């Protein structure tokens, strides 16, 4: 069931997709996902169904009814699907695949054919739609950033540092900056398009944030565009500010004993409509809910029996 202004779900290696609500940490519905692991899941903008992508298939699960099975499944690719997402009105779904391709899909059962393919010589790691639903940033395993505009058929290629694979990228909803992280912790921040008129897509590198000695797994802005959270393989999640790009807050799941030896990474994170409470998905077979100010955890959901590598948290527009 998903009849609620706010919903959140996690997925991992235990072959289940857990749904719950931040009231007491109790699960409502556990959807059966089997024969593969979930790379990433995303909710439809109309809040009717979820879509989880893993290893050559994208499986959609109804939120209104009580169905544990993948009502709609997409096939055709040959490798993993790193990330998925839909148009702001639910018109086309952009799927970046592991092998070499970032493609679009048509969600209508008709011969519309608005689907295209973008092919690069490196495995894709992340795709990020532009806030105006026109451009799309691709980040692959060769440190190259392909800003590809759906208007034209040409894409620019930018390499901050070669021989290192970038892992994620995101653009704040207010279109103020554009950040990305790679497999060594560096976080480059180029200034995104300022020419809203005819999509000039000018890029100037503002600054680089040296942090995350270990691998950096994901970086995400805030819907208020005042914060930027990034998670690393050192069991830390650092939230930085957008004014001077300093270290605003740092959270960690380290117990402080040498007996655990990196018992779990911080795979994913997400903000709230108020930009005050964030949710993090660790590899400790559970997810946590923290506040951006008090630092300490606010809640914990521990219904999983394996690692947790992806989570979705959607809330009302008010916040």
């Amino acid at each position: 069931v998903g009849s609620d202004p706010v919903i959140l779900a996690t997925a991992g290696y235990d072959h289940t997709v857990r749904f719950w609500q931040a009231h007491s940490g109790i699960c409502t519905r556990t959807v059966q996902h089997q024969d593969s692991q979930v790379n990433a899941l995303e909710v439809t903008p109309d809040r009717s169904m979820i879509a989880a992508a893993g290893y050559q298939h994208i499986r959609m699960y109804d939120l209104n009814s009580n169905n544990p099975n993948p009502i709609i499944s997409y096939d055709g690719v040959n490798k993993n699907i790193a990330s998925v997402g839909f148009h702001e009105d639910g018109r086309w779904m952009y799927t970046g695949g592991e092998d070499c391709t970032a493609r679009i899909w048509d969600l209508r059962s008709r011969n519309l054919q608005c689907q295209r393919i973008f092919q690069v010589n490196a495995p894709i790691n992340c795709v990020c739609l532009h806030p105006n639903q026109a451009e799309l940033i691709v980040g692959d395993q060769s440190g190259a950033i392909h800003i590809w505009d759906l208007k034209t058929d040409h894409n620019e290629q930018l390499i901050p540092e070669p021989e290192v694979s970038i892992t994620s990228a995101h653009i704040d909803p207010d279109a103020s900056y554009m950040a990305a992280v790679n497999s060594t912790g560096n976080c480059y921040v180029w200034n995104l398009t300022g020419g809203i008129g005819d999509e000039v897509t000018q890029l100037i590198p503002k600054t680089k944030i040296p942090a995350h000695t270990r691998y950096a797994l994901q970086c995400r802005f805030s819907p208020d565009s005042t914060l930027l959270a990034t998670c690393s393989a050192d069991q830390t999640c650092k939230i930085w500010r957008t004014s001077n790009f300093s270290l605003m807050t740092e959270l960690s799941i380290k117990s402080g004993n040498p007996g655990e030896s990196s018992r779990g990474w911080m795979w994913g994170c997400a903000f709230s409509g108020d930009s005050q409470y964030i949710v993090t998905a660790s590899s400790d077979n559970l997810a946590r809910l923290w506040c951006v100010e008090t630092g300490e955890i606010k809640r914990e959901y521990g219904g999983h029996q394996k690692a947790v590598v992806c989570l979705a948290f959607n809330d009302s527009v008010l916040g």
Binding site: N69, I71, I72, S73, Y74, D75, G76
Partner: peptide
């Protein structure tokens, strides 16, 4: 008859089998 048993199993399974759309 073994083919009758196989037909019964396939009949019962097929009804449960098709419930989803594959694109």
């Amino acid at each position: 008859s073994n083919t009758a048993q196989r037909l019964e199993r396939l009949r019962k399974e097929r009804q449960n089998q098709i419930k989803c759309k594959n694109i």
